[PDB]
C-alpha cells in the first residue's frame, strides 16, 4: 500500500511497497538425526545384536544371528561398511560391502530356515564341512558364517569345473539373495588341503548377470577388520540376487563356500543417508540438515532429499503481503502438496554411478521446477491480496 | 454466484458457490485392448505365422519363417515369453527370453538373406552341419533354427579356444543382432560326438560388452517348452547386438552353434505392455485401463503409460464454472498439449532394473507436475469466469 520498509513482488506489477509481510521461508540448522514421528525408523540392521555391524549380520556371524524387524523408513550411515571380526575377507575384490545397503532397501527381511543346498550331496562329494575358530558360536568353539558351508573334499584331487543350480526356496514375490564365495591359501597349505597348487576359476550366472573370478596363491594383504588370529589364508565373498521363480547357476572348483541360508525379502523401504545414533523425535528427516521439525511451509538453503512431513525447497526468501482474505489464501499456499525424493534403493554407490548421477540431475531439475511453480503461486496470491 | 449445491475452487478466493458446473474429469473402467485408430498396432510378431510364438520367430523356427510387418505402435504381452517346441533350451541361463521384446522396439525388422559366416570355412574345420528332427521344416524331416548352424567336427579331437569375427552384413544405420549359442550333452555322447568329455568355455565381445560361459556335462533339468522327443542333451542360446559399422568377436570350443542369418533393424516403435487379442478399435491405449475412447480432456484414477489420443491424468475431480466466455475457456483447457510416455524400448525387465525404476520415478514426478499445472490453469479459468 503506502510507503513502508516492506516490499513484495508481484507477477504483473513487479516490486511494490506494502505495510507488512508474513514470511514463508526459514533457513534451518544442521542438527543430529532423530526418529521419524509416526514411523518406525531403521537405524542399525539388528539393534538387539550386540557387538556386531550390518555386514556381520548380513554375512550371518555365529554369535549375532537374530530377527530383523520390518521398517518403512531406513537410514544409511556407512557408505563403506566394515566387519567386526571373523575369518579375514578380501572386501574390495567383489561387491560384498554393499549387501547390507541392499538389504536396507527391503521392508521385510528374513533368513531362511532350511538349507537351499545339501552341502554333503553337492558335486565333488564326499565333502566334510570344515570350520575355524576365528569367529565362535554361542559356546566357545569352532564356527563359521550361517550363510555358507566351507566344503573340504575328503578325497584330495584336482577337479574340472563343476555345476550346481540354486533353486527358489521361499515364498513367491520375494527376491532371493544368495551369498557364496571361495577360499584360498598359500602353496603348501592348499597342496595339503585340496591336493592342487594352481589357481582355481569360479563363475556364477543369474538373470543374465555373469561374473568370473580367479583365486590367488601366495602373498596376501595384511589382515583387516577381523578378530586377530594368525591365519595364512583368506576368503573372497560375493552374492547374487534372484527374482521371483528364477534359479541360479554356479560353476566352481576346489575351495568353494556353498550357500546354506539365503536372504529373501519383499516390499520397499524409503532409504535416506545419514548418521547414527538416532536421538529424539523429528517431523522430517533432511539428508543434510539432520532431523528437522516443520514450522513453515517453505525453506531456503541447500536442497537435498528428505522423508516425512517436510517443507518444500525454494531458492529465494518469499514473503506474503499483509495489511479474512489474507488468511483464506495463507492456508491454500500452506496446503500445496509435492511428492518427496529418496534414493533408488537398488542403485549402489560403488557399482552404479551413472544412474545415481542421472538421479541427482533429475532431483535438481525437479527442485527448480517446483521452486518456480511456488514462486508463481506466491506472486499470484499476493497480487490478489494487494488488489 | 448465489446459493447453490455446486461449489468450485478458485486460485485467490478459494471455495465459491456457483449455479452449475461443467465436469472435466471421468474415471474410466478396465476393458480389453483394441487396435489403435489411425495407426497399425503390432500384436503378435508374425500374425500370419500359425502355431508359433514370438520366441519361435526370433530364433528362426523352420516352419514359421516369414516377413515381419513394420509398425509404429507395438504391444508387449509376454513379460517372459516361451517357445512352442523345438530342440530343448536352457532358457534361464542367458538373456535370450528378452530377444522378442528387444525386436519389438524396432519399427522395421527383417532377416538377412545371406549367411554372415560361411560355417564350412570357420576355424576348427572340417565341419559337417548336424541336424535333429525335433522341429521339422516344410517337408517332414530333420531341420534346425535358421539363425544358427550346429557345426559338428569331422575330425574328433579337443581344441584350444578359437576366434571368429562377425562382420556388419547389412545396410548402415541398422543395428545388427547376432544370435549364437552352444550345445552340451552327457559324457559318453560328447566323447562320441566331439572327442572330449570336459566342459567347454565360450565368450563373446561386442561394443565392450563381454560375457563368459562354461558348459555343463551330466545331469540336465527336465525338458520344458519343447516338442516332446526324448533328447539327452540341450543347448544354451545367447545374442549380441552390434551398432552401425561395428563388428563382433566370438571365442569358442567344441559344440558351437555358429550364426547364419542375423536380424538387423532400424527405426523406433512405441512399446506399451498389455494383453492379447486386440479386439475392436480405441482412440487411446492405456497400460492399465485397456483400450479407451477419449471423451473428456482429463481423467482421474491410476496413472500409467498411454499411447495415442489420450486424456491427461489429474489427481482430483476438476470442475469448470457455469452459469460465450464459458465456451472460450472450455476449448482452451481442452486444447492443452502434453506428450505421452512409453517404455524405454531398450531397457529389458530382466536385465535393467535400476533404469526402469528411475524411469517410473520420472513418470510419477512428471504426472504430479502436469497435474499441478492443470489444476492451476483450471483455477485461473474459473476465477476469470466468475469475475
Amino acid at each position, epitope marked *: 500500500s503506502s510507503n513502508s520498509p516492506h516490499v513484495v513482488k508481484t507477477a504483473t506489477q513487479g516490486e511494490v511497497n506494502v505495510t507488512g509481510v508474513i514470511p514463508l521461508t526459514t533457513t534451518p540448522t544442521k542438527s543430529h538425526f532423530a526418529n521419524l*514421528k509416526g514411523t*518406525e525408523t531403521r537405524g542399525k540392521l539388528c539393534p538387539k545384536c550386540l557387538n556386531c555391524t550390518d555386514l556381520d549380520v548380513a554375512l550371518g556371524r555365529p554369535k549375532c544371528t537374530g530377527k530383523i524387524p520390518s521398517a518403512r523408513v531406513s537410514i544409511l550411515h556407512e557408505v563403506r561398511p566394515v566387519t567386526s571380526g571373523c575369518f579375514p575377507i578380501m572386501h574390495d575384490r567383489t561387491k560384498i560391502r554393499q549387501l547390507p545397503n541392499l538389504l536396507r532397501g527391503y521392508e521385510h527381511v528374513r533368513l531362511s530356515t532350511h538349507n537351499v543346498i545339501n552341502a554333503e550331496d553337492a558335486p565333488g562329494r564326499p565333502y566334510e564341512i570344515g570350520t575355524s575358530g576365528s569367529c565362535p558360536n554361542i559356546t566357545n568353539g569352532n564356527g563359521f558364517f550361517a550363510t555358507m558351508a566351507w566344503a573340504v573334499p575328503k578325497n584330495k584331487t584336482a577337479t574340472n569345473p563343476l555345476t550346481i543350480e540354486v533353486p527358489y526356496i521361499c515364498t513367491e514375490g520375494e527376491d532371493q539373495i544368495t551369498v557364496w564365495g571361495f577360499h584360498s591359501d598359500n602353496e603348501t597349505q592348499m597342496a595339503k588341503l585340496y591336493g592342487d597348487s594352481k589357481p582355481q576359476k569360479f563363475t556364477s550366472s543369474a538373470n543374465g548377470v555373469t561374473t568370473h573370478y580367479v583365486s590367488q596363491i601366495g602373498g596376501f594383504p595384511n589382515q583387516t577388520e577381523d578378530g586377530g588370529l594368525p591365519q595364512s589364508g583368506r576368503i573372497v565373498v560375493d552374492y547374487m540376487v534372484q527374482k521371483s521363480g528364477k534359479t541360479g547357476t554356479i560353476t566352481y572348483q576346489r575351495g568353494i563356500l556353498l550357500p546354506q541360508k539365503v536372504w529373501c525379502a519383499s516390499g520397499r523401504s524409503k532409504v535416506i543417508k545419514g548418521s547414527l545414533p538416532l536421538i529424539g523425535e523429528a517431523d522430517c528427516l533432511h539428508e543434510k540438515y539432520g532431523g528437522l521439525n516443520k514450522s513453515k511451509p517453505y525453506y531456503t538453503g541447500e536442497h537435498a532429499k528428505a522423508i*516425512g512431513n517436510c517443507p518444500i525447497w525454494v531458492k529465494t526468501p518469499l514473503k506474503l503481503a499483509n495489511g479474512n482474505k489474507i488468511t483464506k489464501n495463507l*492456508n491454500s499456499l500452506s*496446503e500445496l*502438496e509435492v*511428492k518427496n525424493l529418496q534414493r533408488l534403493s537398488g542403485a549402489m554407490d560403488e557399482l552404479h554411478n551413472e544412474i545415481l548421477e542421472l538421479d541427482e540431475k533429475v532431483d535438481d531439475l525437479r527442485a527448480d521446477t517446483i521452486s518456480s511453480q511456488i514462486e508463481l503461486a506466491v506472486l499470484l496470491s499476493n497480487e490478489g491480496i494487494i488488489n | 454466484s448465489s446459493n447453490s449445491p455446486h461449489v468450485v475452487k478458485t486460485a485467490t478466493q478459494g471455495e465459491v458457490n456457483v449455479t452449475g458446473v461443467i465436469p472435466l474429469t471421468t474415471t474410466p473402467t478396465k476393458s480389453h485392448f483394441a487396435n489403435l485408430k489411425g495407426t497399425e498396432t503390432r500384436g503378435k510378431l508374425c500374425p500370419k505365422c500359425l502355431n508359433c510364438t514370438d520366441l519361435d520367430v526370433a530364433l528362426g523356427r523352420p516352419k514359421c519363417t516369414g516377413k515381419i510387418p513394420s509398425a509404429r505402435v507395438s504391444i508387449l504381452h509376454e513379460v517372459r515369453p516361451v517357445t512352442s517346441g523345438c530342440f530343448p533350451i536352457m532358457h534361464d541361463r542367458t538373456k535370450i527370453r528378452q530377444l522378442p521384446n528387444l525386436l519389438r522396439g524396432y519399427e522395421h525388422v527383417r532377416l538377412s538373406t545371406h549367411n554372415v559366416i560361411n560355417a564350412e570355412d570357420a576355424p576348427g574345420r572340417p565341419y559337417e552341419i548336424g541336424t535333429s528332427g525335433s522341429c521339422p521344416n516344410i517337408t517332414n524331416g530333420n531341420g534346425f533354427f535358421a539363425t544358427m548352424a550346429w557345426a559338428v567336427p569331422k575330425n574328433k579331437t579337443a581344441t584350444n579356444p578359437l576366434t571368429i569375427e562377425v562382420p556388419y552384413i547389412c545396410t548402415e544405420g541398422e543395428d545388427q543382432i547376432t544370435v549364437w549359442g552352444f550345445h552340451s550333452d552327457n559324457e559318453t555322447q560328447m566323447a562320441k560326438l566331439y572327442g572330449d568329455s570336459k566342459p567347454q568355455k565360450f565368450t563373446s565381445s561386442a561394443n565392450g560388452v563381454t560375457t563368459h560361459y562354461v558348459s555343463q556335462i551330466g545331469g540336465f533339468p527336465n525338458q520344458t517348452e519343447d516338442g516332446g522327443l526324448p533328447q539327452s542333451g540341450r543347448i544354451v542360446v545367447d545374442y549380441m547386438v552390434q551398432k552401425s559399422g561395428k563388428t563382433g568377436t566370438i571365442t569358442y570350443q567344441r559344440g558351437i552353434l555358429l550364426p547364419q542369418k542375423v536380424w538387423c533393424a532400424s527405426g523406433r516403435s512405441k512399446v506399451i505392455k498389455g494383453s492379447l487379442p486386440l479386439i475392436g478399435e480405441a482412440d487411446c491405449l492405456h497400460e492399465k485401463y485397456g483400450g479407451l475412447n477419449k471423451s473428456k480432456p482429463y481423467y482421474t*484414477g491410476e496413472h500409467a503409460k498411454a499411447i495415442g489420443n489420450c486424456p491427461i491424468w489429474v*489427481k482430483t475431480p476438476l470442475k469448470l464454472a457455469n452459469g460465450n466466455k464459458i465456451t472460450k475457456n472450455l476449448n482452451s483447457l481442452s486444447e492443452l498439449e502434453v506428450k505421452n510416455l512409453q517404455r524405454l524400448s531398450g531397457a529389458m525387465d530382466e536385465l535393467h532394473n535400476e533404469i526402469l525404476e528411475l524411469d517410473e520415478k520420472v513418470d510419477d514426478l512428471r504426472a504430479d507436475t502436469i497435474s499441478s499445472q492443470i489444476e492451476l490453469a483450471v483455477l485461473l479459468s474459473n476465477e476469470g469466469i466468475i469475475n
Partner: nanobody, 124 residues
C-alpha cells in the same frame, strides 16, 4: 504402527441410511484416511477420502451427493455417512490410511495401513 477397526455394519433395506465408523490411533498431522469397498467377485474400489489435518474431501463419481466423509480428531474417529442405498452397494468396506502424501488419492499402493473389514448387505 496404527490401529484401524471398523464397526457399524449390518443389513439395511434399499432406500434407508447407514453410518460406518473407524477408530485410528497414532495418526500424525499429515495423514490421509480413505474408505474402500469390494463387491463379491471384484476388486476394491475407491469410495472417499479425507485429510486428517484440513479435512479436504475427495468423493468418487459412483457415490457422490449420497455418501459423505468426515473426521473428528478429538475422538480419533472417521465416519462414513450413507444415504439412499441401492442393491449395487452391497460389499465389504475397508478403512485405509497413510502417514504422508503419496503419488495419488486413488489406488491401493498409495495407502499403507489397512483395516480388517466390515460386511454391509442391502436387500428388500
Amino acid at each position: 504402527d496404527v490401529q484401524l477397526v471398523e464397526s457399524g455394519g449390518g443389513l439395511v433395506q434399499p432406500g434407508g441410511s447407514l453410518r460406518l465408523s473407524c477408530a485410528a490411533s497414532g495418526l500424525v498431522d499429515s495423514a490421509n484416511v480413505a474408505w474402500f469397498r469390494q463387491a463379491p467377485g471384484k476388486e476394491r474400489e475407491f469410495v472417499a477420502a479425507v485429510k486428517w489435518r484440513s479435512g479436504s474431501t475427495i468423493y468418487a463419481d459412483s457415490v457422490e451427493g449420497r455418501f459423505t466423509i468426515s473426521r473428528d480428531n478429538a475422538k480419533s474417529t472417521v465416519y462414513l455417512q450413507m444415504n439412499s442405498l441401492r442393491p449395487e452397494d452391497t460389499a465389504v468396506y475397508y478403512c485405509a490410511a497413510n502417514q504422508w502424501y503419496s503419488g495419488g488419492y486413488y489406488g491401493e499402493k498409495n495407502y499403507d495401513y489397512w483395516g480388517q473389514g466390515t460386511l454391509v448387505t442391502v436387500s428388500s
